[PDB]
Amino acid sequence: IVGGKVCPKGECPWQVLLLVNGAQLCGGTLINTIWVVSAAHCFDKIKNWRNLIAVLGEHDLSEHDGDEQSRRVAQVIIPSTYVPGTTNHDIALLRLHQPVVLTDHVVPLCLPERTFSERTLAFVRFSLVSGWGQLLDRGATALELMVLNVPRLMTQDCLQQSRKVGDSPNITEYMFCAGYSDGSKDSCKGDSGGPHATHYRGTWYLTGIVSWGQGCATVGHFGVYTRVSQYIEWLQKLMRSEPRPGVLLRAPFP
Amino acid sequence: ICVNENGGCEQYCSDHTGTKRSCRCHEGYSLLADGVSCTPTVEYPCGKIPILEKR
Numbered sequence: 001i002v003g004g005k006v007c008p009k010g011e012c013p014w015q016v017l018l019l020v021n022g023a024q025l026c027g028g029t030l031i032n033t034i035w036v037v038s039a040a041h042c043f044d045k046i047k048n049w050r051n052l053i054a055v056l057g058e059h060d061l062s063e064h065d066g067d068e069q070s071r072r073v074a075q076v077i078i079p080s081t082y083v084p085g086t087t088n089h090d091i092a093l094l095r096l097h098q099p100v101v102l103t104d105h106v107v108p109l110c111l112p113e114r115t116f117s118e119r120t121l122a123f124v125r126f127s128l129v130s131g132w133g134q135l136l137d138r139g140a141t142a143l144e145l146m147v148l149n150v151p152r153l154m155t156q157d158c159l160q161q162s163r164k165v166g167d168s169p170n171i172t173e174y175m176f177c178a179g180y181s182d183g184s185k186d187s188c189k190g191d192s193g194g195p196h197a198t199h200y201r202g203t204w205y206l207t208g209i210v211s212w213g214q215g216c217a218t219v220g221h222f223g224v225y226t227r228v229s230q231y232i233e234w235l236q237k238l239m240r241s242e243p244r245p246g247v248l249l250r251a252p253f254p
Numbered sequence: 255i256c257v258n259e260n261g262g263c264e265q266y267c268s269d270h271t272g273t274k275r276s277c278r279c280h281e282g283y284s285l286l287a288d289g290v291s292c293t294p295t296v297e298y299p300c301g302k303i304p305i306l307e308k309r
């Protein structure tokens with residue numbers, strides 16, 4: 001996260017840290033005691049599927065304070081439409097091997113209904129993005145969880161306000177733009193898969209997943225987030241299904 | 255009705271035949287007798303921050 005602040009410990013309790021062989025991979029969002037939402041692209045280069053760990057209640061990576069809860073990732077479910085090495089349909093649903101225990105420091109974010117998300121949440125201007133990602137473009141990652149407030153843009157307005165670069169990926173209906181074009185504030189490498197959380201009438205909801213951008217906080221560019229509302233029905237159906245053998249599962253989308 | 259200001263619902267809204275609207279809540283919440291508000295039924299409902307709720 002570039003240009004944000006430290007999320008006070010316990011104020012981002014749905015934040016997930018994903019690890020591979022104990023090393024920082026990506027972020028995620030807890031949506032109930034067993035299920036985590038992350039980005040499909042985080043799994044493009046995984047070979048050691050058995051060494052994938054999700055950590056809940058994490059805050060400071062330098063110390064163990066006892067609020068952390070680690071779980072093996074039993075399954076990673078990706079839409080059939082996602083293509084490795086690309087940006088479209090950038091979502092993954094992760095089943096934990098054992099549920100996390102809900103506490104003051106481990107709480108799920110609400111996965112909203114599709115109509116509520118499209119008709120109401122999509123018009124809430126500011127939302128929070130968080131992670132232990134790079135603090136600067138080509139910079140060091142954070143030891144404490146960071147959070148940033150970002151405004152959402154209509155895709156026409158994002159394309160109008162953005163500088164042309166060439167060979168740049170298109171903004172599809174499965175994405176949205178959020179952030180600032182003045183090079184001060186953005187999500188960054190390592191924040192991928194983390195939450196874009198929206199407040200509405202005293203409750204927080206999952207509206208986006210940190211996905212991509214053309215460098216962190218690049219002047220003339222905004223952050224790109226997976227538009228979660230497109231996937232509500234897809235996620236709900238998978239969560240009502242029995243686990244299948246094998247860590248990686250490709251599920252038909254729609 | 256649900257299209258305009260979430261039909262007055264705190265959480266989810268369902269449109270019905272005629273001038274009928276039913277508000278609903280996410281799991282871990284119940285609808286109040288006002289028919290719009292949602293109250294937690296569990297200790298750790300989704301989307302609430304305990305350290306902020308407790309103070």
Ligand SMILES: COc1ccc(-c2ccc(C(=O)N[C@H](CO)C(C)(C)C)cc2C(=O)O)c(C(=O)Nc2cccc(C(N)=O)c2)n1
Nearest residue numbers: 024025041087187188189190191192211212213214215216
């Ligand atoms: C879509 O596929 C992909 C595929 C791979 C990457 C990607 C490439 C490299 C790194 C990276 O350097 N990772 C590190 C370990 O190797 C570490 C986690 C930062 C310590 C991290 C990512 C990442 O997923 O965050 C990315 C990516 O960089 N996304 C992203 C997220 C947020 C902001 C920006 C940005 N504005 O540049 C980019 N996107």
Ligand SMILES: [Ca+2]
Nearest residue numbers: 060061063064
């Ligand atoms: Ca820690």
